[PDB]
Amino acid sequence: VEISALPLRDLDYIKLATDQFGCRFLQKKLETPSESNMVRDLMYEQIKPFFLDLILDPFGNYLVQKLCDYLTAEQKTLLIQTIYPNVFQISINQYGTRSLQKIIDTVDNEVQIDLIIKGFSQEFTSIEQVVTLINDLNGNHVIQKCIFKFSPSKFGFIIDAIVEQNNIITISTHKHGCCVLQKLLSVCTLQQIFKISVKIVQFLPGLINDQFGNYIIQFLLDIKELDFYLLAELFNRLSNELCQLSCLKFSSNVVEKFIKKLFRIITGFIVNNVASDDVINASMNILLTTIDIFTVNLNVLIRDNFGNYALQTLLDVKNYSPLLNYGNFCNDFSLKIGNLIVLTKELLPSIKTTSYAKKIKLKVKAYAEAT
RNA sequence: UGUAUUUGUA
Numbered sequence: 001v002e003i004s005a006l007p008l009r010d011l012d013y014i015k016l017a018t019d020q021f022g023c024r025f026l027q028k029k030l031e032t033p034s035e036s037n038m039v040r041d042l043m044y045e046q047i048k049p050f051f052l053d054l055i056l057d058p059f060g061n062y063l064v065q066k067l068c069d070y071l072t073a074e075q076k077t078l079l080i081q082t083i084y085p086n087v088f089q090i091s092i093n094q095y096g097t098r099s100l101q102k103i104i105d106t107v108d109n110e111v112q113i114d115l116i117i118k119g120f121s122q123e124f125t126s127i128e129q130v131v132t133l134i135n136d137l138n139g140n141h142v143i144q145k146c147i148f149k150f151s152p153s154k155f156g157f158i159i160d161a162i163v164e165q166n167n168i169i170t171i172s173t174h175k176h177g178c179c180v181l182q183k184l185l186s187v188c189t190l191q192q193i194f195k196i197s198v199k200i201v202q203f204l205p206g207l208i209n210d211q212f213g214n215y216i217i218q219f220l221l222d223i224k225e226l227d228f229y230l231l232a233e234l235f236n237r238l239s240n241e242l243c244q245l246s247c248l249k250f251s252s253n254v255v256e257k258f259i260k261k262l263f264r265i266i267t268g269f270i271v272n273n274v275a276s277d278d279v280i281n282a283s284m285n286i287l288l289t290t291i292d293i294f295t296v297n298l299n300v301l302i303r304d305n306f307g308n309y310a311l312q313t314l315l316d317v318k319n320y321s322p323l324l325n326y327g328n329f330c331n332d333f334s335l336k337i338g339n340l341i342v343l344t345k346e347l348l349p350s351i352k353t354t355s356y357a358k359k360i361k362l363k364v365k366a367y368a369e370a371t
Numbered sequence: 372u373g374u375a376u377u378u379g380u381a
Contacts, residue, residue: 020381021381023381024381058380058381059380059381061380061381062380062381094378094380095380097378097380098378098380137377137378138377138378140377141377141378175375175376175377176376176377178375178376179375179376179377211374211375212374212375214374214375215374215375249373249374250373250374252373252374253373253374305372305373306372306373308372308373309372309373354372355372356372359372
C-alpha cells in the first residue's frame with residue numbers, strides 16, 4: 001500500500017519473500033517489464049543466503065518458482081549450486097517439491113542438470129532415501145519430473161536404487177512407486193529396462209498377484225523388444241502355478257494379457273503369409289502347453305470367480321481365427337483347441353447356476369460358426 | 372461375474 005511508493009533499492013526483500021502479499025508484490029514486479037530485471041537483480045543478492053529456506057516456505061516457494069522464469073543462466077546455476085545437496089529434504093517437502101519441479105523444468109544447460117543429478121547421487125542422497133522419494137507423496141513428482149526432463153543417461157541414481165537387493169518389491173507394490181516405475185520404463189534405454197527386468201523376474205512371486213505389482217508385469221508384456229526372452233522366462237517361472245495364478249484376483253489379469261500376447265504374435269506372423277522368428281517359435285510351444293494346462297484344469301477354471309475369465313480369453317475365436325513350420329503348429333492348435341471346446345460344452349450343464357454360463361456358451365457357439 | 376492415479380500449496 002505504501003510499499004509500492006518505495007524505491008526498489010530500499011525494499012526488504014527477505015521479509016517480503018516470506019509474506020503472502022509481499023511475495024505477490026514481488027511477483028507482480030517481476031512481471032513488470034520496465035522493472036523486471038532490476039527487481040530481479042536487487043532481490044537476488046539479498047535472498048541468496050536463504051535459497052533453501054524460501055524453497056521450503058509456504059509463500060517463498062511461489063517467489064522462487066516465478067524467479068525461475070526470469071533468472072539469468074548465471075543466477076540459476078548459483079541457485080542450484082547452493083541447494084543441490086538438499087534435494088532429498090526439498091523433494092519430500094510439500095512446498096519444496098513445487099519449487100524443485102519448477103527448477104528442473106527450467107534448467108538452462110547441462111551444468112545445471114549435472115549439479116541436480118549430483119545431489120541425487122549417493123554422495124548426498126542414500127539409495128534408501130531415493131526409494132523413499134520414489135514412493136513419497138511429494139517426492140515422486142520430483143522423480144517423475146527428472147524422468148521426463150532429463151536424458152536417460154542421467155537415470156543412474158534411479159536405476160541403482162531400484163535394482164538394489166529387493167527394492168523392486170518396495171517400489172512395484174507401492175501405490176505411487178508403481179506409477180513412477182512405469183513412467184521410467186516408458187522412456188529409459190533398452191539396457192536399463194533389462195537390468196530392471198532381471199530384478200522383476202527374480203522377485204516375480206511377490207509381484208504377480210500384488211494389487212499394484214501385477215500392472216508392472218503387464219507393462220513389461222507390452223514392450224516388444226523384450227519378447228525374445230520375457231515370454232519363455234515368465235512361462236518357465238510360472239507354468240507350474242498357471243492354474244492357481246489364473247484363479248487369483250490380480251494375477252488372473254496377467255495371465256489373460258500373456259495369453260492375448262501369444263495369440264497376437266502368432267497371428268501377426270500368419271497374416272504375413274512382425275516379430276522375429278525365435279519369438280514366434282517360442283510362443284507356439286507355450287500356447288500349446290497352455291492349452292494342455294487349461295484342458296487338464298478345466299473343471300476348476302470354468303467354475304472359478306477369476307479363472308473363468310482366463311478360460312474365456314483362451315477360448316475366444318476372435319483371438320485366433322487365422323490359426324484355423326506353421327503347417328504342423330496350426331494343425332496341433334486346431335486339435336487341442338477343438339478338444340477344449342468340446343470338453344467345455346460337456347461341462348455347461350454343471351455351471352448352469354453361474355451368471356457367466358451364457359457367455360461361455362456363446363464362445364462355444366462362435367467357434368462352431370467359424371469352423 | 373474381476374484390480375491402481377497422488378496436487379485446488381497463497
